[PDB]
Paper text:
We introduce a new family of fungal protease inhibitors with β-trefoil fold from the mushroom Coprinopsis cinerea, named cocaprins, which inhibit both cysteine and aspartic proteases. Cocaprins are small proteins (15 kDa) with acidic isoelectric points that form dimers. Cocaprins inhibit plant C1 family cysteine proteases with Ki in the micromolar range, but do not inhibit the C13 family protease legumain, which distinguishes them from mycocypins. Cocaprins also inhibit the aspartic protease pepsin with Ki in the low micromolar range.
CCP1 crystallized in P21 space group with two molecules in the asymmetric unit. CCP1 has a β-trefoil fold, consisting of only β-strands. The fold resembles a tree with a six-stranded β-barrel as a stem and additional three pairs of β-strands and connecting loops as the tree crown. The three-dimensional structure of cocaprin 1 showed similarity to fungal β-trefoil lectins. Based on the crystal structure, we designed mutations in the surface exposed loops, which were of sufficient length to be able to inhibit aspartic and cysteine proteases. Equilibrium constants were determined for the inhibition of papain and pepsin, which indicated that the β2-β3 loop containing the N22R mutation was involved in papain inhibition because this mutant had an approximately ten-fold higher Ki value. Since the same mutant had a Ki value for pepsin inhibition comparable to that of the wild type CCP1, this suggests that the inhibitory reactive sites for aspartic and cysteine proteases are located at different positions on the protein. Only the N22 mutation in CCP1 significantly reduced its ability to inhibit cysteine proteases, suggesting that the β2-β3 loop is critical for inhibition, which is different from that of clitocypin. The corresponding loop in CCP1 is much shorter and consists of only five residues (Val99-Ala103). It makes a rather tight turn between β strands β9 and β10 and does not protrude from the globular core of the protein, so it is unlikely to be involved in aspartic protease inhibition.
Author numbering: 3 to 138
Write the structure that this text describes.
């Protein structure tokens, strides 16, 4: 479905599935490889699955239970995300565990460093929780 890149607003790096283990989700400088492209499938009511182009793995969280600092990971099963415009800047998006306050978060204050882990964390104003979803 609609294939998109997902760039962190604060870090400037792409949501990337580690090319070596195909499991760890981290920020990496955008190069346009399939591991940085994500198939957004609309389930309904602006709920989505987000499926890596490289592996077919779905964006999810380790062990499925949302909490502060639970890391993002690739799953063989679908995991549902709410995707909506940020409240302060309508031009960017949040990607969240549905009906929870746990938002997809670029760790270490949205560090631009390649390999910066992506996780979920309680919703804050931080642009490290804001993403640009755009075609590629």
């Amino acid at each position: 479905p609609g294939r998109y890149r997902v760039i962190n607003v604060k870090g400037g790096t792409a949501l990337d599935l580690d090319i070596n283990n195909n499991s760890t989700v981290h920020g990496w400088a955008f190069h346009g490889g399939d591991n940085q492209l994500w198939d957004f499938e609309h389930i309904g009511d602006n709920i989505w699955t987000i499926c890596n182009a490289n592996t077919g793995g779905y964006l999810a969280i380790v062990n499925g239970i949302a909490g502060d600092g639970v890391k993002a990971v690739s799953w063989a099963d679908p995991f549902e995300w709410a995707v909506w415009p940020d409240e302060n800047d309508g031009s960017v998006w949040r990607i969240g565990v549905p009906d929870t306050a746990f938002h997809l978060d670029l760790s270490d204050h949205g560090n631009s460093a390649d390999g910066t882990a992506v996780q979920v964390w309680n919703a804050s104003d931080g642009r490290n929780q804001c993403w640009v979803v755009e075609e590629a």
